[PDB]
């Protein structure tokens, strides 16, 4: 009623305009949590992604869409205290090298890397926090796995590997290995995918990815679903 | 739709 | 070889002295005294604005002013009374999960998985609010900030570490450790000589903020501990945690006294605080709604039934006037 | 080595404290609710004419 | 006799349905789904169209039955207005909801600038505005003439009459049927092309079901919408052009037709709400 009270009163509302203006931006951002161990190959892609043609947070338009990823691999903390407020992130993220199948270092040793990036898998695959949230699995260098498995057998990682030591066996065994770790198979979708270092290839697949999701969540709001 |  | 075993001894010497300390526990001697009764507090204001979940909130000295933090990367100073907006702060870092206001009104500092604890200044000349500390060191994620001054802040981090920071220089002055586990909360203490930090070990730890060193241990819970309130005159504290289970241990007693539980709760805490007389225990629940303990009966005396989500933050008025509550839906409601 | 002996020296610090029968702060704590009762909105609901919500 | 009180009780039952089926809408609307959705706003629109639609329809059965009109030239006005600006917000509300699923589905990337609920709120007033532009010159161009024993709603006929109603039958058969057929199948045809592609669709048996389960609702929503619309509109372009006999069968078969068109709106909030997957989680 006061003069300042209306001066007061006009001022929130003009915080709430933009308010409202950064809200609607922020909607029309794809959030795509990243995930991955060590030297898993996480930034790189980031890298190949910007140049194809704490928290690291990237940003970058593609298509019209504009993918924003988020990395949390600086952080040394417990995962389950701070992966709730990644919920409802569009996707995540998942890189897997696809070489280190034999280069488990890590900490101490036996630490069996590639198992370790098996369970990581099934920790946030099987999340409480990402049932309905779809994952883009990237199987980083296969360059390197196509001139190991020739040299040091698979079965050194997997000893109940049965099969040909060439890559496509290799790889195709990977991949089945990486999806039946997925017990909710009518809730989510893992987009399995080959990185390569060509002219905007990992940026296609993943603006796939998003636009399959994007339709998945439209079917559910619409009605349909 | 037509009236009668 | 033998300091394992020792220490395993200096474990079971300091059980055996808090058993023949305890004799009451606050169940022999509060039976004689009347119920609350039930209490129905009803909603004044709904803070609107907000578009994502809220993760912290702090009320000001003031009892009027209120700063909230959310996953929109905005912090926004409300008036309770009018419901009008004083600020709306951008963050650099959107994944914000505390947020403290200093007790002058001054400044008010935010802070989360970026490592570092943000001080923006409020009363300042040029208008607009601006950032002028931003306090790094600590590696993993800040789960609670509190002003001591105008220039010293405490933090917990997830990093098992507590530290205690001079603003100016941006330095810290004493670091707090001994938790194995991630601290998540913190409270300082009506004189802010001790306070107290919640971990994810099921452990409370009283610290001394001038020595810098643990004064006292305290365990009991089964489970992670997510919220940590002294009483107001100092001499106990309350803890809220995964289990669904509050307890109220006690500093001189250096022991818990009372337990706040019910069957049809499965669901953790995420907030705790109390009321300006201590007898009132607030606590914010996953199950959408706050829950209005008898701190000295244990019995629940009112439900705080308004959000659509899991409620994140809560606060008392320094006056005991309201109760503000925030959620994951993107709402306070401030309850009388 | 030094984590044993340094878990060691704090049980050594927390254990030579003074500690006070329950019964004796758990009276206190109530003495405390009972003095400020009547100062507490929450607990005791304040008339609309002074209540400021 | 027989004949007229099968009108009626058709005719009632109708518009049971018609009342009963929006106002429960309605109710779940307001009470479960807060209007925060633009499929809501829509379903919203969708059924205040039909009930006021099936409301235009005891009037008539009355007129129909004392062969006159007891309600005056004010309520004659109000009721013709009512019926045409209600089939064509209907029709036009059927429309945006295919154009809203056909952009939700095939451009999901625009779909996010645009499927917000000031949007469709924005486009229900557009079309509600665009209903407006042909119930209102018939608003004020409907009239009560006199005969020698019966009183008829009718229209004035600006000289000449035969082009003035060849021009508006025609533009309700285009803006009323061969319109709305057209947008309906192309974006739900557009729309089963694209879902064909999804790979959560296109999966286990589950999702094969599901898919089918999503194909089946737009057929039957498509084949409810042409089986509800085209035999009136045909009979009714039948009668322009050929005289035909008043006799029983004649009359039934009118009578039918213009039932049929009404089960359309009827039918609406079936199809577009109690089979919405959105409504089903509210109980």
Known sequence: ?225 | ?4 | ?336 | ?53 | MVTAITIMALYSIVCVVGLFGNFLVMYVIVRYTKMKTATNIYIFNLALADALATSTLPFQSVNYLMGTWPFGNILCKIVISIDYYNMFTSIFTLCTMSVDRYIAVCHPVKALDFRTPRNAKIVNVCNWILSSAIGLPVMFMATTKYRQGSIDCTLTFSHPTWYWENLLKICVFIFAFIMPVLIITVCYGLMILRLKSVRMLSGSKEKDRNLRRITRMVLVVVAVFIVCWTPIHIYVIIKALITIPETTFQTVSWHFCIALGYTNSCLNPVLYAFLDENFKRCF
């Open chain 3, 1 to 336: 070889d033998q300091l394992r075993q020792e220490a395993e001894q200096l474990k079971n010497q300091i059980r055996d002295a808090r058993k023949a300390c305890a004799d009451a526990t606050l169940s022999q001697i509060t039976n004689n005294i009347d119920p609350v009764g039930r209490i129905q507090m009803r909603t004044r204001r709904t803070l609107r604005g907000h578009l994502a979940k809220i993760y912290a909130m702090h009320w000001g000295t003031d009892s009027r002013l209120l700063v909230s933090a959310s996953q929109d990367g905005k912090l926004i100073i409300w008036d309770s009374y009018t419901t009008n907006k004083v600020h709306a702060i951008p963050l650099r870092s959107s994944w914000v999960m505390t947020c403290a206001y200093a007790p002058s009104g001054n400044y008010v500092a935010c802070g989360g998985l970026d490592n570092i604890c943000s001080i923006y200044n409020l009363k300042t000349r040029e208008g607009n609010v601006r950032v002028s500390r931003e306090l790094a060191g600590h590696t993993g994620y800040l789960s609670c900030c509190r002003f001591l001054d105008d220039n010293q802040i405490v933090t917990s981090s997830g990093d098992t570490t507590c530290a205690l920071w001079d603003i100016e220089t941006g330095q810290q002055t004493t670091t707090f450790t001994g938790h194995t586990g991630d601290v998540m909360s913190l409270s300082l203490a009506p004189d802010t000589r001790l306070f107290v930090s919640g971990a994810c070990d099921a452990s409370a730890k009283l610290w001394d903020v001038r020595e810098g060193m643990c004064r006292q241990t305290f365990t009991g819970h089964e489970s992670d501990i997510n919220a940590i309130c002294f009483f107001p005159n100092g001499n106990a504290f309350a803890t809220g945690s995964d289990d669904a289970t509050c307890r109220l241990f006690d500093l001189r007693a250096d022991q818990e006294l009372m337990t706040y539980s019910h069957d049809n709760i499965i669901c953790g805490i995420t907030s705790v605080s109390f009321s300006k007389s201590g007898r009132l225990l607030l606590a914010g629940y996953d199950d959408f709604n706050c829950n209005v303990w008898d701190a000295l009966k244990a019995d629940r005396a009112g439900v705080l039934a308004g959000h659509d989500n899991r409620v994140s933050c809560l606060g008392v008025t320094d006056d005991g006037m309201a109760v503000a509550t925030g959620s994951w839906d993107s709402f306070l409601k401030i309850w009388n």
């Open chain 1, 1 to 225: 009623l006061s003069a300042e009270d209306k001066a007061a009163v006009e001022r929130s509302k003009m915080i709430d305009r933009n308010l409202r203006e950064d809200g609607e931006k922020q909607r029309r951002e794809i959030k795509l949590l990243l995930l991955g161990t060590s030297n898993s190959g996480k930034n790189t892609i980031v890298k190949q992604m910007k140049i194809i043609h704490g928290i690291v947070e990237n940003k970058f338009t593609f298509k019209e869409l504009t993918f924003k990823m988020v990395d949390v691999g600086a952080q040394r903390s417990e995962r389950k205290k701070w992966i709730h407020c990644f919920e409802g992130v569009t996707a995540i993220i998942f890189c897997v090298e696809l070489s280190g199948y034999d280069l488990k270092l890590y900490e101490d040793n036996q630490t069996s890397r590639m198992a370790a990036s098996l369970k990581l898998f099934d920790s946030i695959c099987n999340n409480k926090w990402f049932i309905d949230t779809s994952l883009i699995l990237f199987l980083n260098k296969k360059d390197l796995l196509a001139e190991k498995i020739r040299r040091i057998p698979l079965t050194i990682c997997f000893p109940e590997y049965k099969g040909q030591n060439t890559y496509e066996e290799a790889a195709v065994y990977i991949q089945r290995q990486f999806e039946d770790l997925n017990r909710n198979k009518e809730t989510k979708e893992i987009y399995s995918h080959f990185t390569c270092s060509t002219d905007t290839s990992n940026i296609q697949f993943v603006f796939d990815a998003v636009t399959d999701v994007i339709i998945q969540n439209n079917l559910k709001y619409i009605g349909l679903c």
């Open chain 4, 1 to 53: 080595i030094a984590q044993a002996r340094k878990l060691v020296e704090q049980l050594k610090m927390e254990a030579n404290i003074d500690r006070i029968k329950v019964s004796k702060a758990a009276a206190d704590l109530m003495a405390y609710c009972e003095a400020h009762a009547k100062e507490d909105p929450l607990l005791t609901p304040v008339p609309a004419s002074e209540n400021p919500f």
């Open chain 2, 1 to 4: 739709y037509p009236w009668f």
